Amino acid sequence: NSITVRARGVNGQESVSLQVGGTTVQTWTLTTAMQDYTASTSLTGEIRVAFTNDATGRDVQVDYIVVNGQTRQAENQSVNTGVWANNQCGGSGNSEWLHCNGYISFGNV
Ligand SMILES: OC[C@H]1O[C@@H](O[C@H]2[C@H](O)[C@@H](O)[C@H](O)O[C@@H]2CO)[C@H](O)[C@@H](O)[C@@H]1O
Ligand SMILES: [Ca+2]
Ligand SMILES: [Ca+2]
């Protein structure tokens, strides 16, 4: 499988991990502009994009991923454990943003 993540940080120090079934497939440091990050995997389970180094000044915006050619918008995903919403991390779904450490789930490969 081929997976492309389109994402940015706000300050350029942010780290994200592409995970499949809980296995980290690849980690990247983001820049302050949307860019594409691509990895391959034989794994087939639940895809997550996780922000792992939250700190002052650091937040992640994930536009979408592409899975074997299918674009899956971050904001179309019901599960986002990092968005700051309703005064808490993970207070709602359907967001591009990871403010807190947490992940967006994009369903199975
Ligand atoms: O401190 C909890 C959490 O805050 C996040 O920023 C929030 C902020 O707390 C809130 O006052 C403001 O209006 O919303 C922002 C998010 O947009 C911060 O991004 C997290 O790193 C931090 O854990
Ligand atoms: Ca989007
Ligand atoms: Ca933050």
Coordinates of N, CA and C and ligand atoms in Angstrom, one line a residue:
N1 N 0.8 -1.2 0.0 CA 0.0 0.0 0.0 C 0.8 1.2 0.0
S2 N 0.3 2.3 -0.6 CA 1.0 3.6 -0.6 C 0.1 4.6 0.1
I3 N 0.7 5.3 1.0 CA 0.0 6.3 1.8 C 0.7 7.6 1.7
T4 N 0.0 8.7 1.3 CA 0.6 10.1 1.3 C -0.2 10.9 2.3
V5 N 0.6 11.6 3.2 CA 0.0 12.5 4.2 C 0.3 13.9 3.7
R6 N -0.7 14.8 3.6 CA -0.5 16.2 3.3 C -0.8 17.0 4.6
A7 N 0.2 17.6 5.2 CA 0.2 18.2 6.5 C 1.2 19.3 6.6
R8 N 1.0 20.1 7.7 CA 1.9 21.2 8.1 C 1.9 21.3 9.6
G9 N 2.9 21.9 10.1 CA 2.9 22.4 11.5 C 2.7 23.9 11.4
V10 N 2.6 24.5 12.6 CA 2.5 25.9 12.8 C 3.9 26.6 13.0
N11 N 4.8 25.9 13.7 CA 6.1 26.5 13.9 C 7.3 25.7 13.3
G12 N 7.0 24.6 12.7 CA 8.1 23.9 12.0 C 8.9 22.9 12.8
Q13 N 8.5 22.7 14.1 CA 9.1 21.7 14.9 C 8.3 20.5 15.2
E14 N 7.0 20.5 14.7 CA 6.1 19.4 14.9 C 6.5 18.1 14.3
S15 N 6.3 17.0 15.0 CA 6.5 15.7 14.6 C 5.2 14.9 14.5
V16 N 5.0 14.2 13.4 CA 3.9 13.3 13.2 C 4.4 11.9 12.8
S17 N 3.5 11.0 13.2 CA 3.7 9.6 12.8 C 2.5 9.0 12.1
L18 N 2.8 8.4 11.0 CA 1.9 7.6 10.3 C 1.8 6.2 10.9
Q19 N 0.7 5.8 11.4 CA 0.6 4.5 12.1 C -0.5 3.6 11.4
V20 N -0.3 2.3 11.3 CA -1.2 1.4 10.8 C -1.4 0.3 11.8
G21 N -2.6 0.1 12.4 CA -2.8 -1.0 13.4 C -1.9 -0.7 14.7
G22 N -1.5 0.5 14.9 CA -0.7 0.8 16.1 C 0.8 0.8 15.8
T23 N 1.2 0.2 14.6 CA 2.6 0.2 14.2 C 3.0 1.5 13.6
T24 N 4.0 2.2 14.0 CA 4.5 3.4 13.3 C 5.2 3.0 12.0
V25 N 4.7 3.4 10.9 CA 5.2 3.2 9.6 C 6.3 4.2 9.3
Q26 N 6.1 5.4 9.6 CA 7.1 6.5 9.3 C 6.8 7.7 10.2
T27 N 7.9 8.4 10.6 CA 7.7 9.6 11.3 C 8.4 10.7 10.4
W28 N 7.8 11.9 10.5 CA 8.3 13.1 9.8 C 8.3 14.3 10.7
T29 N 9.2 15.2 10.5 CA 9.1 16.6 11.0 C 8.5 17.4 9.9
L30 N 7.5 18.2 10.3 CA 6.7 19.1 9.4 C 7.4 20.4 9.2
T31 N 7.0 21.1 8.1 CA 7.3 22.5 7.9 C 6.1 23.3 8.2
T32 N 6.2 24.6 8.0 CA 5.1 25.5 8.2 C 4.1 25.6 7.0
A33 N 4.3 24.9 5.9 CA 3.5 24.9 4.8 C 3.1 23.5 4.5
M34 N 1.9 23.3 3.9 CA 1.4 22.0 3.5 C 2.4 21.4 2.6
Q35 N 2.8 20.1 2.8 CA 3.6 19.3 2.0 C 3.2 17.9 2.0
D36 N 3.6 17.1 1.0 CA 3.3 15.7 1.0 C 4.4 14.8 1.5
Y37 N 4.0 13.8 2.3 CA 4.9 12.9 2.9 C 4.4 11.5 2.5
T38 N 5.2 10.6 1.9 CA 4.7 9.4 1.4 C 5.5 8.2 2.0
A39 N 4.8 7.1 2.3 CA 5.3 5.9 2.8 C 4.6 4.7 2.2
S40 N 5.2 3.6 2.2 CA 4.7 2.3 1.8 C 4.5 1.4 3.0
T41 N 3.5 0.5 2.9 CA 3.4 -0.5 4.0 C 2.6 -1.7 3.4
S42 N 2.9 -2.8 3.9 CA 2.2 -4.1 3.7 C 1.1 -4.3 4.8
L43 N 1.0 -3.5 5.8 CA 0.0 -3.5 6.8 C -1.3 -3.1 6.3
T44 N -2.4 -3.5 6.9 CA -3.7 -3.3 6.3 C -4.7 -2.7 7.3
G45 N -4.3 -2.5 8.6 CA -5.2 -2.1 9.6 C -5.5 -0.6 9.7
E46 N -6.0 -0.1 10.8 CA -6.5 1.2 11.0 C -5.3 2.2 10.8
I47 N -5.5 3.2 9.9 CA -4.6 4.2 9.7 C -4.8 5.4 10.7
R48 N -3.8 5.9 11.3 CA -3.8 7.1 12.1 C -2.6 8.0 11.7
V49 N -2.9 9.3 11.8 CA -1.8 10.3 11.7 C -1.8 10.9 13.1
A50 N -0.7 10.7 13.8 CA -0.5 11.2 15.2 C 0.5 12.2 15.3
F51 N 0.1 13.3 16.1 CA 1.0 14.4 16.6 C 1.6 13.9 17.9
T52 N 2.9 14.0 18.1 CA 3.5 13.3 19.3 C 4.4 14.3 20.1
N53 N 4.7 15.5 19.7 CA 5.6 16.4 20.4 C 5.0 17.7 20.7
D54 N 3.7 17.7 21.1 CA 3.0 19.0 21.4 C 3.9 19.7 22.5
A55 N 3.8 21.0 22.4 CA 4.5 22.0 23.3 C 4.0 23.3 22.9
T56 N 4.4 24.3 23.7 CA 4.1 25.7 23.4 C 4.4 26.0 21.9
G57 N 3.5 26.6 21.2 CA 3.7 27.1 19.9 C 3.6 26.0 18.8
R58 N 3.3 24.8 19.2 CA 3.3 23.7 18.2 C 1.9 23.1 18.1
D59 N 1.4 23.0 16.8 CA 0.1 22.4 16.4 C 0.3 21.9 15.0
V60 N -0.6 20.9 14.7 CA -0.6 20.3 13.3 C -1.9 20.5 12.6
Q61 N -1.8 20.8 11.3 CA -3.0 20.8 10.4 C -2.7 19.7 9.4
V62 N -3.6 18.7 9.3 CA -3.6 17.7 8.3 C -4.7 17.9 7.3
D63 N -4.3 18.2 6.1 CA -5.3 18.4 5.1 C -6.1 17.1 4.8
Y64 N -5.4 16.1 4.4 CA -5.9 14.8 4.0 C -4.8 13.8 4.0
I65 N -5.2 12.5 3.8 CA -4.2 11.5 3.3 C -4.8 11.0 2.0
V66 N -3.9 10.2 1.3 CA -4.2 9.5 0.1 C -3.8 8.1 0.3
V67 N -4.7 7.1 0.1 CA -4.5 5.7 0.3 C -4.7 5.0 -1.0
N68 N -3.6 4.5 -1.6 CA -3.7 3.8 -2.9 C -4.6 4.6 -3.8
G69 N -4.4 6.0 -3.9 CA -5.0 6.8 -4.8 C -6.3 7.5 -4.3
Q70 N -6.9 7.0 -3.2 CA -8.1 7.6 -2.6 C -7.8 8.7 -1.6
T71 N -8.2 9.9 -1.9 CA -8.1 11.0 -0.9 C -9.1 10.8 0.2
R72 N -8.7 10.9 1.4 CA -9.5 10.8 2.6 C -9.3 12.1 3.4
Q73 N -10.2 13.0 3.4 CA -10.0 14.3 4.1 C -10.0 14.2 5.6
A74 N -9.0 14.8 6.2 CA -9.0 14.8 7.7 C -10.3 15.2 8.4
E75 N -10.9 16.3 7.8 CA -12.1 16.8 8.4 C -13.3 15.9 8.2
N76 N -13.2 14.9 7.3 CA -14.3 13.9 7.1 C -14.2 12.7 8.1
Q77 N -13.2 12.7 8.9 CA -13.0 11.6 9.9 C -13.6 11.9 11.2
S78 N -14.4 11.0 11.7 CA -15.1 11.2 12.9 C -14.3 11.2 14.2
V79 N -13.1 10.5 14.2 CA -12.3 10.4 15.3 C -11.0 11.2 15.2
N80 N -10.9 12.2 16.1 CA -9.7 13.1 16.2 C -9.5 13.4 17.6
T81 N -8.5 12.8 18.2 CA -8.2 12.9 19.6 C -7.4 14.0 20.1
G82 N -6.8 14.8 19.1 CA -6.0 15.9 19.4 C -6.6 17.3 19.2
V83 N -7.7 17.4 18.5 CA -8.3 18.7 18.3 C -8.7 19.3 19.6
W84 N -8.5 20.6 19.8 CA -9.0 21.3 20.9 C -10.4 21.8 20.5
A85 N -11.4 21.2 21.2 CA -12.8 21.5 20.9 C -13.6 21.3 22.2
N86 N -14.6 22.1 22.4 CA -15.3 22.0 23.7 C -14.4 22.0 24.9
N87 N -13.4 22.9 24.9 CA -12.4 23.1 26.0 C -11.7 21.9 26.4
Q88 N -11.4 20.9 25.5 CA -10.7 19.8 25.8 C -10.1 19.2 24.5
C89 N -9.0 18.4 24.8 CA -8.4 17.7 23.7 C -9.4 16.6 23.3
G90 N -9.7 16.4 22.0 CA -10.6 15.4 21.5 C -12.0 15.7 21.8
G91 N -12.4 17.0 22.0 CA -13.7 17.3 22.3 C -14.8 17.1 21.2
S92 N -14.3 17.0 20.0 CA -15.1 16.7 18.9 C -14.3 16.0 17.8
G93 N -14.9 15.6 16.7 CA -14.3 15.0 15.6 C -14.3 16.0 14.4
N94 N -14.0 15.4 13.2 CA -14.2 16.1 12.0 C -13.4 17.4 12.0
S95 N -12.1 17.3 12.2 CA -11.2 18.5 12.1 C -9.9 18.1 11.5
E96 N -9.3 19.0 10.7 CA -7.9 18.9 10.3 C -6.9 19.1 11.3
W97 N -7.3 19.6 12.5 CA -6.3 20.1 13.5 C -6.0 19.0 14.6
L98 N -4.7 19.0 14.9 CA -4.2 18.3 16.1 C -3.5 19.4 16.9
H99 N -4.2 19.9 18.0 CA -3.7 20.9 18.9 C -2.9 20.2 20.0
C100 N -3.4 19.1 20.5 CA -2.8 18.3 21.6 C -2.2 17.1 20.9
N101 N -1.3 16.4 21.6 CA -0.9 15.1 21.2 C -2.2 14.2 21.0
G102 N -2.2 13.5 20.0 CA -3.4 12.7 19.6 C -3.3 12.4 18.1
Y103 N -4.4 11.9 17.6 CA -4.4 11.4 16.3 C -5.7 11.6 15.6
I104 N -5.7 11.5 14.3 CA -6.8 11.4 13.4 C -6.9 10.0 12.8
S105 N -8.0 9.3 12.9 CA -8.2 8.0 12.4 C -8.8 8.1 11.0
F106 N -8.2 7.4 10.0 CA -8.7 7.4 8.6 C -9.3 6.1 8.2
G107 N -9.6 5.2 9.1 CA -10.1 3.9 8.8 C -9.0 3.0 8.3
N108 N -9.5 1.7 8.0 CA -8.5 0.7 7.5 C -7.9 1.0 6.2
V109 N -6.7 0.5 6.0 CA -6.1 0.7 4.7 C -7.0 0.2 3.6
Ligands
LIG1 O1 -3.5 23.7 27.5 C1 -4.3 22.8 26.8 C2 -3.9 22.8 25.3 O2 -4.2 24.1 24.8 C3 -4.1 24.2 23.4 O3 -4.4 25.6 23.0 C4 -5.7 25.9 23.1 C5 -5.8 26.9 24.3 O4 -5.6 26.2 25.5 C6 -7.1 27.7 24.3 O5 -7.1 28.6 25.4 C7 -7.2 28.3 22.9 O6 -8.3 29.2 22.8 O7 -7.4 27.2 22.1 C8 -6.1 26.6 21.9 C9 -6.0 25.7 20.8 O8 -6.4 26.3 19.6 C10 -2.8 23.8 22.9 O9 -2.7 23.8 21.5 C11 -2.4 22.5 23.4 O10 -1.0 22.3 23.1 C12 -2.5 22.4 25.0 O11 -2.3 21.1 25.4
CA2 CA -8.8 18.9 4.1
CA3 CA -0.5 22.6 20.7

